[PDB]
Design a protein around this nucleic acid. Sequence first.
RNA 1: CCGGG
RNA 2: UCCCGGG
Length: 475
Amino acid sequence: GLIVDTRDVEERVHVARKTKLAPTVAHGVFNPEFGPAALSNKDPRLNEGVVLDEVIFSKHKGDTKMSAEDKALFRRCAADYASRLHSVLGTANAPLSIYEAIKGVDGLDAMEPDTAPGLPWALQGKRRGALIDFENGTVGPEVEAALKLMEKREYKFACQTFLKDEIRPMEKVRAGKTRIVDVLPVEHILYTRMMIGRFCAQMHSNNGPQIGSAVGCNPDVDWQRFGTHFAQYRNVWDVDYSAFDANHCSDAMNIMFEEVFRTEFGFHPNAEWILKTLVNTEHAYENKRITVEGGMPSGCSATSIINTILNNIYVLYALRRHYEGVELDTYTMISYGDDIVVASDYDLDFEALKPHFKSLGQTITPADKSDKGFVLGHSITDVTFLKRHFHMDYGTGFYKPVMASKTLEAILSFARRGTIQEKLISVAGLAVHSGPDEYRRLFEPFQGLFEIPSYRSLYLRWVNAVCGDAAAALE
RNA sequence: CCGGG
RNA sequence: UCCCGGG
């Protein structure tokens, strides 16, 4: 987005400063080129003379304005995808009750009861539990008063910027490219869930190529579904974006919201209104307040869904801007926010689409670094989706999500205090797909120290997970 | 609590 | 932080 104003200010929102991610015994063995993001501006691991506060917001390069003709084209694409979407999900998009929005429904998990509340509550020193009753599914006066302002479209808010405490490639650590998290007020999250929660629930439940969304999928089971779909196409592309979230233009966001969340598709009028409050935002980071036009706040309710929907419209838009007679049948895709796999029998030229995506403010590049440009004839077994390759399991003949051993090494190399046992169990569920020898090697550092699930036990669990009756081949 | 986006 | 998936 475009920074329009950055006045310094009285009140101060102090972040975090130091990581909770401490090295494990595995770190000494694998010595990964990965470490915790820089959270302090004076982190010695940083490159000298590189201030952390600058690079955080460098992603805000501007808010691409589109022509009348590009907007009408985009409107057509948004409406075309919307048609497909609401056809599959139905039109029961009436507001969720307060209770439902808090407690969730089938396809939509309940709100986190003790996550950050946002502004202005964090300046008062107050937790989510004080504002909202998560067991009961009810709200205090302050939230109800905010609820009332949103009804009448008079509600205004600020986003609380947090530095993301996570493992990053050391190049990005040293370059100070710590990701941020735009924390919205808990009431904003609540109302958004009220306005579009059922839609979201339906999306999650209906995940797959048809709606072009993997939000809600379970890679253990769904890799067989997705893998077999995409293997039917002659060409598959693995597309990377540069700062996807920041670079959604005001025009694209507004038109997408206008076409997808219409009252004629069952939504309350304020579905459109509440989503449109994400366009022009005020961000609070320490003593500064930054006003941004364009871009999606990473950490609002349904950020993943909104990004996924945009991804879908972008691909349609870019193809129709370059080629003639392009429809939704012309290709297939699945995305998860900025992450995307696209396939087609037509030999599309994604190199030629680069400028057409640029007209939206988005920079596409191939997922592999080498080979200067996009290439034809790539298959499903060459691409990364959700940091997972599609490899055929030779025991069952099903697709399994394989993570790169270097990534698993990095994950296993760091942990927060007193979680190591728990993390190992969780990560073993990722690592089983790398096969027995690699599984043994990844956990070898932890032997004698923690309980490591046997390879065999997780393999049988998985064989049941994918279908179930494949397990019931007792010969 | 862990992974992914 | 938001969702998603798994304990």
